[PDB]
Structure formats: structure tokens, C-alpha cells
């Protein structure tokens, strides 16, 4: 109901996620709600980690890769893995 | 080499130079879009050459279509007078260029 295209820096979300959810459990396919600057986002767990794991623990020294959901208008600018690059050329 | 491009173009305008650079970059980008790797992008001298040849008509420059329209069968040396006239034109050209 409150969708918007307003640009939100991704590094701020990454730092907030790391600080708030330190020492928390995440499993592939899990869903949760993330509070950032008085706004609620529906986070869906996609991949967890070079060993590959499906369930793990969140620690402060980890990295986080935010990817905007399908057809999401959120312009996730910044240094994160927003997936803003279309590899190769689409060539419609 | 920037010097070669600077020497080649004469009586151009700044707008025309910007247009030339844009044309070269667009040609390179379209070539790579055609592709057969979007990280090895570069601009080649061939792009400048093609863009200059097939586009960018300087207002105060020289056109070729009008030449191709006026002279339509070249020149055939059928006698001395053609050589005489051609050799005499150069004298006037030199006089206007030097003195």
C-alpha cells in the first residue's frame, strides 16, 4: 500500500541489518520483517554462505547482499548487490 | 592520436566536434550491443573514421555529393587543350594562395 520509488542507500540498510539482527538464525526460504528508518520491509532469505549452507547464524563480521524483489520499485542504490547490472546485452 | 584528428578537421564548430565524439561513441556502443562481454568496451580509430566519413556535414566545409553530381564522367585526355587548362589553373591557385 505504501510502495515508492524513492532512492534508499543500501549501505544504511546493511549496517542496520547487521546491528539489529546480530546473533540471529536464518534459513533458506525464511521470511521476516525489517525495520529501517520507521519503514517495514518484507525480507525473504535466498542464499546463505567457500562453503554453501541452507541454515546459519548472523554475526557482525558477515556480509549482506540486498536484492530488490521482483518488479520492486525500490531504487536500491549504493555499494550493495542490488543487481543493477544486466550482464551481457539483453538485445530485445 | 588527438593531434591527427585535430589536424584533419578544419573549419569545424564546437557543436560539430561534440557531435563527432558522440557519433563515434554511439557507433562503438552499438557494435558491442550487436556483440557476436560488456566489460572490454573501447573506442577504435575506425569508429572515428567511419563517423567522419558517413556523417557530420560541416556547414562551412566541403561537400562531395555536389561534386559527384556536377562531374559525371571524369576527365578523358583527348588532346592538348585539357592539359593546358588544367596546368594553367594551378597558376591562379598558387597566386591566390601565396602573394
- Is B35 within 8 Å of A91 (Cβ atoms)? yes
> Determination method here?
cryo-EM
Q: Which long-range contacts (CB under 8 A, 24 or more apart) does A69-76 make?
A: A69/A42, A69/A44, A73/A3, A73/A4, A73/A5, A74/A4, A74/A5, A74/A6, A74/A8, A75/A5, A75/A6, A75/A7, A75/A8, A76/A8, A76/A10, A76/A13
Alpha carbons within 13 A on the beta-carbon side of B71: 5
Which residues in chain B are closer than 8 Å to A88, comparing Cβ atoms? 35, 37-38
Asked if A89 reaches chain B (Cβ–Cβ under 8 Å), the answer is yes
Kindly report the nearest CA distance between residue A84 and chain B, in angstroms: 14
Residue B77 Cα distances to B82, B85, B91, angstroms: 6, 11, 20
| Interchain contact A91–B (C-beta under 8 A) | yes
- Joined together, the cell numbers standing for residue A88 give 551481457
Q: Specify the DSSP element, H or E, that contains A26.
A: strand A25-27
Q: Is A49 helix (H, G, I), strand (E, B) or coil?
A: coil
Does A37 reach chain B within 8 Å, measured CB to CB?
no
Which residue is associated with the grid cell 530485445?
A92
In angstroms, the CA A44 to CA A30 distance is 6
Resolution, given in Å to one decimal, reads 4.0
Per DSSP, B60 falls in state: T
Which chain B residues contact residue A89 at CB under 8 A? 32-33, 35, 38
- For B39-60, b/e burial (b = at least 16 CB within 10 A) is eeeeeeeebbeebeeeebebee
Rounded to whole angstroms, the Cα distance separating B88 from B95 reads 11
Amino acid at each position: 500500500k505504501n510502495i515508492d520509488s524513492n532512492p534508499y542507500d543500501t549501505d544504511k540498510m546493511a549496517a542496520e541489518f547487521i546491528q539489529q539482527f546480530n546473533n540471529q538464525a536464518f534459513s533458506v526460504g525464511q521470511q521476516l520483517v525489517f525495520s529501517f528508518n520507521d519503514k517495514l520491509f518484507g525480507l525473504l532469505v535466498k542464499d546463505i554462505e567457500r562453503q554453501k549452507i541452507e541454515v546459519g547464524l548472523v554475526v557482525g563480521n558477515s556480509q549482506v547482499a540486498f536484492e530488490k524483489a521482483e518488479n520492486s520499485s525500490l531504487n536500491l542504490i549504493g555499494k550493495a548487490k542490488t543487481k543493477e547490472n544486466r550482464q551481457s546485452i539483453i538485445n530485445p | 592520436d588527438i593531434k591527427e584528428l585535430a589536424v584533419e578537421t578544419k573549419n569545424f564548430s564546437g557543436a560539430e566536434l561534440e557531435g563527432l565524439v558522440r557519433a563515434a561513441q554511439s557507433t562503438a556502443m552499438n557494435r558491442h550491443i550487436k556483440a557476436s562481454k560488456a566489460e572490454s568496451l573501447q573506442v577504435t580509430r575506425g569508429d572515428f573514421l567511419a563517423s567522419l566519413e558517413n556523417d557530420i556535414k560541416p556547414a562551412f566545409g566541403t561537400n562531395q555529393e555536389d561534386y559527384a553530381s556536377y562531374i559525371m564522367n571524369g576527365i578523358i585526355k583527348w588532346g592538348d587543350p585539357v592539359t593546358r587548362v588544367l596546368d594553367d589553373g594551378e597558376l591562379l591557385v598558387q597566386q591566390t594562395k601565396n602573394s
